[PDB]
Design a protein around this nucleic acid. Structure first.
Ligand SMILES: [Mg+2]
Ligand SMILES: [Mg+2]
Ligand SMILES: [Mg+2]
Ligand SMILES: [Mg+2]
Ligand SMILES: [Mg+2]
Ligand SMILES: [Mg+2]
Ligand SMILES: [Mg+2]
Ligand SMILES: [Mg+2]
Ligand SMILES: [Mg+2]
Ligand SMILES: [Mg+2]
Ligand SMILES: [Mg+2]
Ligand SMILES: [Mg+2]
Ligand SMILES: [Mg+2]
Ligand SMILES: [Mg+2]
Ligand SMILES: [Mg+2]
Ligand SMILES: [Mg+2]
Ligand SMILES: [Mg+2]
Ligand SMILES: [Mg+2]
Ligand SMILES: [Mg+2]
Ligand SMILES: [Mg+2]
Ligand SMILES: [Mg+2]
Ligand SMILES: [Mg+2]
Ligand SMILES: [Mg+2]
Ligand SMILES: [Mg+2]
Ligand SMILES: [Mg+2]
Ligand SMILES: [Mg+2]
Ligand SMILES: [Mg+2]
Lengths: 51, 49, 148, 55, 160, 223, 185
RNA sequence: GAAAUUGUUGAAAGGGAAGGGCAUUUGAUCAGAC
RNA sequence: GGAAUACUGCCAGCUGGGACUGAGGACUGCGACGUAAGUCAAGGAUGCUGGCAUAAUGGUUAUAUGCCGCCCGUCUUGAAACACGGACCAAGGAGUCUAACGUCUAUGCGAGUGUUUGGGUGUAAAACCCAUACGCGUAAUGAAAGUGAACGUAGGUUGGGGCCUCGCAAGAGGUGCACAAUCGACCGAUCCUGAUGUCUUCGGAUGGAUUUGAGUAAGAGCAUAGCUGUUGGGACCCGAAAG
RNA sequence: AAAUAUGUAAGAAGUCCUUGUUACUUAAUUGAACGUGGACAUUUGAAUGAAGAGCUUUUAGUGGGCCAUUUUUGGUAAGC
C-alpha cells in the first residue's frame, strides 16, 4: 500500500539485501588500501614539466 | 443532389398531392354498415337467400 | 419517439449540428437529380454505371401473363408429395406403383436439373423440362410426361 | 490561394502510410498464358499422382 | 503558354549516355539470366526506345514476376497519397541489372550454413548474428623514441 | 480442513532461507569482483607510469541519458528518436548501451538531452529509490526480490543486486533487463542546474550534450 | 505533459455483454461467465463470446451442414454445438443419430433429428453433460452470404452489384457498361 | 396578484463609473450537535 | 628527504533543528533481534493531557483591504473596436410529419414469410378468429428468339479457432467450421472448330477460348419496431426586385 | 563532384539433399514452375522500440486561411 525507501529504513534494506549486514559489520566502505611504492619515470616528469 | 451511394428513387410527389389524400378512418364503421345492410336485406327478402 | 432524437441533445448549441461556416441552405446543388451529367458526374459514374442511353428494342403492349414459368429444381421435387405418404413411397415403390407428381397443379412451368434425387421411379407431369433434368429422371428410373 | 502542399504530409501520416499485404500463391493472371495452361495441367497431374501413391 | 506533362518531360540529363559511352551495348547485358523472384534495379538506356520505363522508376528496385521473349515484368511499390500501390512494369532487359546486395546476402547464407555445420562437426555452438562496431579496449602507448612534441597556436602573419 | 499451518509454513520458510543463502553468496562475489577491477586499473596506470608509457583506459560501454527539453516544437526526426529511446517527458531517464548505432542516435537528439557515463553509486541509488518494473503492461514497484525472480529469473537474475550487476557490467541480457525496468521519472535538480541558461552545449556553458562525468552530480541532485 | 504515442481513453472494439433483454439469455451468460472464469477449458470462452453476438453474426445452420460435418474422420460420435438456430433442409434424404445442442430449433429440424434417432438439448444441459467441452464440435453458418455483402465495396472494375430498386433492360445497362455506349467500366 | 419601474422606513458604501475572482478582518444573522 | 593540508570522489558512518501528510481497517506477506516462546521502526498513527460546550469553530450576508479582471452574441486569417444586433421586463418563438429507401440494432417465425382489401364475431372504431389470392424470397443470363447450374467424400494447395490421441507438460500427430489467398469444375452470353442425320435446310452433336455475367458449388429470407443518413413535399424559422 | 533528402535487402513464405507432375521448353534422361520424403530452434541470422495486431461497414464538418526561420521567381522596390 505504501512505497518504503531503502537507503533509509534499515528494515527494508535488510529485507532486500542480506549482504548489507556484513558490509556494515566489517565496515567495507572505509577500506584501507595497502601501500605501494612505484616511482614515476624521468621521461614522464620531464615532459610534464617542460617538454 | 446526388451523393453517398444509394438507389435511385422515383417518388412522384411534385403536384398538389396534399389536396387528394384519402385516409381510411371509417374501416370499422363501413364494416358495421355493410353488416347492417346485409341483415336488413335478408329480413326484407326472407326466406330467399 | 421524439425524446430519443438528437434534436433534443442539440438544444443550446447554436447551429444544431449543421456547421458555422457552411450555414445550412435550401438546395445546395439543385433539386432531385439535377446536374447528373455536369457537376454530379463522378458520383453517377462511380456508383451508377449504365444510367444514360438506350439499349435493346421496344415491346408495345407487353403482357406478363405470357411469360409465366416458375422453375423447380430436381432436388426440391420430393417436397411435392405430402409427408405422410413420402416415406412409404421412399421405401415401398417399384416401377409398378410409382407416384405421379403434377407440377402444374403445384404452380410450376419448367423443371430444371440442379441436385440429386434418390433411386425411386416417379412420373412427372410438366409443361417444359430441360435436357439434364429429363436425363436424371430417366436415370433414376422414371419418365417425364408432357402436358399442355 | 492557387496551390499549396502545406499540411498534406501531416494528413498522410495521421493514419500512417501502409504497405500492402503480400500472400503466398500470387495471382497468375498477367503471367504468360502458355506457362499458365501448362501449370494447370502439371498441378492436376501432381494432384492425381499424390492421390494415387499417397494414401 | 501552358504547362506540359508529356511522357518524357524533364528528362534532359536522365536519359543521356555517359562520357565516351555511346554507341551499342555489350553482350553480357543480353547474356544474363533472370528468374521469377530475382531483385533488379532500374536504370534506363536512352539508346533503346522500346521497352523504356517512366522517369519515376529510374533508380528503383523491384521483384521479377514474369519472364517473356525479350522482356521481364517487375513489381514496384509506389506512394500514392496515404498508401502504397503495387505497379507492374514490363521492361526490356537492356534497362535492368541484378542487385548486388542479394548476391552478398546469398553468399552470407551459404557461409552461415557452412559455419554452423563445421561448428556442429567440431562440437561447439558459434554465434552467427552480425554485431555493430564496439568501443575500444585498453592498451599501452610506449614512448621508445616517440617522445611527445609540444604544439602551440600560430600567430597571424609573422611567419608567413 | 487440512493441517495447513505448519507443513507448508515450514516448507515456505525453508525455501526462503535457501534463496537468501544463494543471494548472500552471489552478493559477496560481486563485491569482490568490483573491488578487484578498480584496484587492478589503478595499479595498471601506476605501472605504465613507472615503465615510462601511458595507459589508455578502455572506452565506456554504458551511458545514462536524461531528457531536458519539454514536448512542444520538436522536429519529426528527433521526436521519433526520443520516442524510440522512451524519453516521452521532461526529466525522464534511461540507460543506453554504447555502439555505433546508438552513437548516431545520440548525435541526432543532442540538443534535447544530457547524457554521461554513470557510476556504480548512482546506478545503485537510482535502482533502489526509483526502480519500477514492467509486469503485464503495468508499472510495479520492485520492493522485493520475488518480483525480480518471477519475471527476470529466466535469465538467471533473481535479486535487485543481480539486476544492478547486469546493468553496470553490460552482460548478455542487458536488453531484457533494461527493457524490464520502467523509464526513470526524476524531479528537478535540488540545487539548480548551475548555469543561467541551459539550452546551450555543456562546453559553451549550458546543459546539453555529453558532460561524461558530471552526470553523477546532476542525477544525484535530481534523484 | 507527455509526448503521447496513441489515443488515450480508447475502448476495445468488442461487445462485452448481449444487447438483448432476453432474461434466459442473461441466465446462460451468467452460467458461462462462471464456467469460463473457474475452468481452464478454451471451449467455455468461445461459447461465452459467441453468446454476445448479433443476428447477422450468428447465421442459421442447416441439418445438411451438420450431417456433412459428422461425415468427418472420427467425428461421427461427437456432440454438435451451434450458438444459434438450427434450420431444416429437404435436399438431404438420410440423417444420422447424433446429439445437437443449440439455442433454437425450427420445428422441422427438431422433428427430423428426433425421427432420425437423436436428441435436441439446450446449452445448460450441455454444460451439465460436459463442463469442459469434452467431445464437442462447434459449427458456424455462412457469414458472407447475406444480400447486403453483394454491394459492399462498390467501384469501377470491382465486380459488385449496384444498389438498385428495379431490374430490366432499361435499368443501368447502357453508357458505362458497354463499349458501344461510350465505355465499359 | 410575478417582473420591469416607483414611494416610505431601517442598514451600509461613495476624492472622475458600477459590477467580478482568490483570500481574510469587521458588523449582522443562522443550522447541526454534544 | 619526510610529512601535512587543499581539490575531487565514496561509506549498506553517526547525529541535531523545521515544515506538510496519516490513505487503509480481523488474520494471511517479506523480514529483523533472540538458543526459543516472544518482541519489533517489518504489506499506510497511535499514546497521554487540557480548555470549551456555545454563536466559540463554521456557514450565509453587507462591506473593507491586497493582487488580478475591457461588452456580450455573430461573420472573419484577424473583435474591446470608430464592423453588425442589443433601453428594460413578461409571455410566445425555429430540424416537424409523410411516401419510398441505405447501413446498423432488437424481436417473431424460418425455405419460407406477411391475420387487419374482405369475411366471422364482439362486453363494439378495441380484443379474438379465418378462406382464396397476392407481394417479397427460394435461378441466372441475353437486345431478343431462347437456354438454364455435382467428373469428384460438392475438388486440390496454403493458413485457421475449437475438439481428439500421446507425452508429467511446452511439444508431436489427427480432424479441421467461419473467414482470407490461389488453381480447377458447372450454368448463360460472345467467338473459334464445325460431324453422324435431315421435307437437304433444317437440325448443332462435339471440342476449345490472355473473352464476358449484378451466377452455381448442403439455401437466408420475410415481417414489425428504433437511432442515424437520403430524395420529393412549405420541409429548421423569417426576407426580394418579379410573373 | 559534396552535405541534406531518396529506393532495396538484412531468412521458416528460409537453406540443403533426394526424386514426382506437365499439353511449356531442350538434341537429350535438359530446364522451368509446383511438390512428396529427409536434415537444420540455448542466436531463427544487425540496433532500438512496440501504448495489442489485422479487417469491415457507415456517416459528420471542411473545401476563404494566415505567420515565422531558411531556399527562391517577377516587379527600383513595399505590410507588392
Ligand atoms: Mg450533422
Ligand atoms: Mg459537363
Ligand atoms: Mg427470362
Ligand atoms: Mg482555394
Ligand atoms: Mg498545423
Ligand atoms: Mg514505335
Ligand atoms: Mg535561470
Ligand atoms: Mg419590484
Ligand atoms: Mg485511517
Ligand atoms: Mg459568524
Ligand atoms: Mg470567523
Ligand atoms: Mg463574516
Ligand atoms: Mg488589470
Ligand atoms: Mg466580439
Ligand atoms: Mg455597435
Ligand atoms: Mg442600435
Ligand atoms: Mg428589441
Ligand atoms: Mg476451394
Ligand atoms: Mg463462362
Ligand atoms: Mg452458395
Ligand atoms: Mg420557408
Ligand atoms: Mg424529409
Ligand atoms: Mg415570401
Ligand atoms: Mg417571366
Ligand atoms: Mg519438404
Ligand atoms: Mg465535400
Ligand atoms: Mg465558404
Amino acid at each position: 500500500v505504501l512505497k518504503k525507501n531503502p537507503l533509509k529504513n534499515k528494515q527494508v534494506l535488510l529485507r532486500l539485501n542480506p549482504y548489507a549486514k556484513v558490509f556494515a559489520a566489517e565496515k567495507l566502505g572505509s577500506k584501507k588500501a595497502e601501500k605501494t611504492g612505484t616511482k614515476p619515470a624521468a621521461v614522464f616528469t620531464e615532459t610534464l614539466k617542460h617538454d | 443532389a446526388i451523393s453517398k451511394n444509394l438507389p435511385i428513387l422515383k417518388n412522384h410527389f411534385r403536384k398538389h398531392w396534399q389536396e387528394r389524400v384519402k385516409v381510411h378512418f371509417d374501416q370499422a364503421g363501413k364494416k358495421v354498415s355493410r353488416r347492417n345492410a346485409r341483415a336488413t336485406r335478408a329480413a326484407k327478402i326472407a326466406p330467399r337467400p | 419517439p421524439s425524446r430519443f432524437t438528437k434534436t433534443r441533445k442539440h438544444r443550446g448549441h447554436v447551429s444544431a449540428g449543421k456547421g458555422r461556416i457552411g450555414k445550412h441552405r435550401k438546395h445546395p446543388g439543385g433539386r432531385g437529380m439535377a446536374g447528373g451529367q455536369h457537376h454530379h458526374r463522378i458520383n453517377m459514374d462511380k456508383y451508377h454505371p449504365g444510367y444514360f442511353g438506350k439499349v435493346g428494342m421496344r415491346y408495345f403492349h407487353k403482357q406478363q401473363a405470357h411469360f409465366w414459368k416458375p422453375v423447380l429444381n430436381l432436388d426440391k421435387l420430393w417436397t411435392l408429395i405430402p409427408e405422410d405418404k413420402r416415406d412409404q413411397y421412399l421405401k415401398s415403390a417399384s416401377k409398378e406403383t410409382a407416384p405421379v407428381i403434377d407440377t402444374l397443379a403445384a404452380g410450376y412451368g419448367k423443371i430444371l436439373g440442379k441436385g440429386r434425387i434418390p433411386n425411386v421411379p416417379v412420373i412427372v407431369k410438366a409443361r417444359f423440362v430441360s435436357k439434364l433434368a429429363e436425363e436424371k429422371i430417366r436415370a433414376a428410373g422414371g419418365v417425364v410426361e408432357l402436358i399442355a | 490561394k492557387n496551390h499549396t502542399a502545406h499540411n498534406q504530409t501531416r494528413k498522410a501520416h495521421r493514419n500512417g502510410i501502409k504497405k500492402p499485404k503480400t500472400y503466398k500463391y500470387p495471382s497468375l493472371k498477367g503471367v504468360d498464358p502458355k506457362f499458365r495452361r501448362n501449370h494447370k495441367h502439371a498441378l492436376h497431374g501432381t494432384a492425381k499422382a499424390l492421390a494415387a501413391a499417397k494414401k | 503558354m501552358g504547362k506540359s506533362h508529356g511522357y518524357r518531360s524533364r528528362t534532359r540529363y536522365m536519359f543521356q549516355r555517359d562520357f565516351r559511352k555511346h554507341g551499342a551495348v555489350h553482350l553480357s547485358t543480353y547474356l544474363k539470366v533472370y528468374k521469377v523472384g530475382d531483385i533488379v534495379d532500374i536504370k534506363a538506356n536512352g539508346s533503346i526506345q522500346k521497352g523504356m520505363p517512366h522517369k519515376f522508376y529510374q533508380g528503383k528496385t523491384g521483384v521479377v514476376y514474369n519472364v517473356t521473349k525479350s522482356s521481364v515484368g517487375v513489381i514496384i511499390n509506389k506512394m500514392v497519397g496515404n498508401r502504397y500501390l503495387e505497379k507492374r512494369l514490363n521492361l526490356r532487359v537492356e534497362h535492368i541489372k541484378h542487385s548486388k546486395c542479394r548476391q552478398e546476402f546469398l553468399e552470407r547464407v551459404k557461409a552461415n550454413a557452412a559455419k554452423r555445420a563445421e561448428a556442429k562437426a567440431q562440437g561447439v555452438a558459434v554465434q552467427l548474428k552480425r554485431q555493430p562496431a564496439q568501443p575500444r579496449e585498453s592498451r599501452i602507448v610506449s614512448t621508445e623514441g616517440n617522445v611527445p612534441q609540444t604544439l602551440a597556436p600560430v600567430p597571424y602573419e609573422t611567419f608567413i | 480442513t487440512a493441517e495447513q499451518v505448519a507443513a507448508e509454513r515450514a516448507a515456505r520458510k525453508a525455501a526462503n532461507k535457501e534463496k537468501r543463502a544463494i543471494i548472500l553468496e552471489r552478493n559477496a562475489a560481486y563485491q569482490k569482483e568490483y573491488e578487484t577491477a578498480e584496484r587492478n586499473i589503478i595499479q595498471a596506470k601506476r605501472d605504465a607510469k613507472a615503465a615510462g608509457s601511458y595507459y589508455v583506459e578502455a572506452q565506456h560501454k554504458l551511458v545514462f541519458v536524461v531528457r531536458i527539453k519539454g514536448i512542444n516544437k520538436i522536429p519529426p526526426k528527433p521526436r521519433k528518436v526520443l520516442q524510440l529511446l522512451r524519453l516521452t517527458r521532461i526529466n525522464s531517464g534511461t540507460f543506453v548501451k554504447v555502439t555505433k548505432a546508438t552513437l548516431e542516435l545520440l548525435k541526432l537528439i543532442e540538443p534535447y538531452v544530457a547524457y554521461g557515463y554513470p557510476s556504480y553509486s548512482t546506478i545503485r541509488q537510482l535502482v533502489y529509490k526509483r526502480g519500477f518494473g514492467k509486469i503485464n503492461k503495468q508499472r510495479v514497484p520492485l520492493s522485493d526480490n520475488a518480483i525480480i525472480e518471477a519475471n527476470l529469473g529466466k535469465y538467471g537474475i533473481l535479486s535487485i543486486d543481480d539486476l544492478i550487476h547486469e546493468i553496470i557490467t553490460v552482460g548478455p541480457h542487458f536488453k531484457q533487463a533494461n527493457n524490464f525496468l520502467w523509464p526513470f521519472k526524476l524531479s528537478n535538480p535540488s540545487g539548480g542546474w548551475g548555469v543561467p541558461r541551459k539550452f546551450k552545449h555543456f562546453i559553451q556553458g549550458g546543459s546539453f550534450g555529453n558532460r561524461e562525468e558530471f552526470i553523477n552530480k546532476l542525477v544525484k541532485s535530481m534523484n | 505533459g507527455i509526448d503521447h504515442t496513441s489515443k488515450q481513453h480508447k475502448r476495445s472494439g468488442h461487445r462485452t455483454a448481449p444487447k438483448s433483454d432476453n432474461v434466459y439469455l442473461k441466465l446462460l451468460v451468467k452460467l458461462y461467465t462462471f464456467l469460463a472464469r473457474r475452468t481452464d477449458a478454451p471451449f467455455n470462452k468461445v461459447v461465452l463470446k459467441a453468446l454476445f453476438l448479433s443476428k447477422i453474426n450468428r447465421p442459421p445452420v442447416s441439418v445438411s451442414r451438420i450431417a456433412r460435418a459428422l461425415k468427418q474422420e472420427g467425428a461421427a460420435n461427437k456432440t454438435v454445438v451451434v450458438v444459434g438456430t438450427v434450420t431444416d433442409d429437404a435436399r438431404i434424404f438420410e440423417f444420422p443419430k447424433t446429439t445437437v445442442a443449440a439455442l433454437r430449433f425450427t420445428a422441422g429440424a427438431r422433428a427430423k433429428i428426433v425421427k432420425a434417432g437423436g436428441e435436441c438439448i439446450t446449452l445448460d444441459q450441455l454444460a451439465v453433460r460436459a463442463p469442459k467441452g469434452q467431445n464437442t464440435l462447434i459449427l458456424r453458418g455462412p457469414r458472407n452470404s447475406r444480400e447486403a455483402v453483394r454491394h459492399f465495396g462498390m467501384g469501377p472494375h470491382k465486380g459488385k452489384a449496384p444498389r438498385i430498386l428495379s431490374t430490366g433492360r432499361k435499368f443501368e445497362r447502357a453508357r458505362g457498361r458497354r463499349r458501344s455506349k461510350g465505355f465499359k467500366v
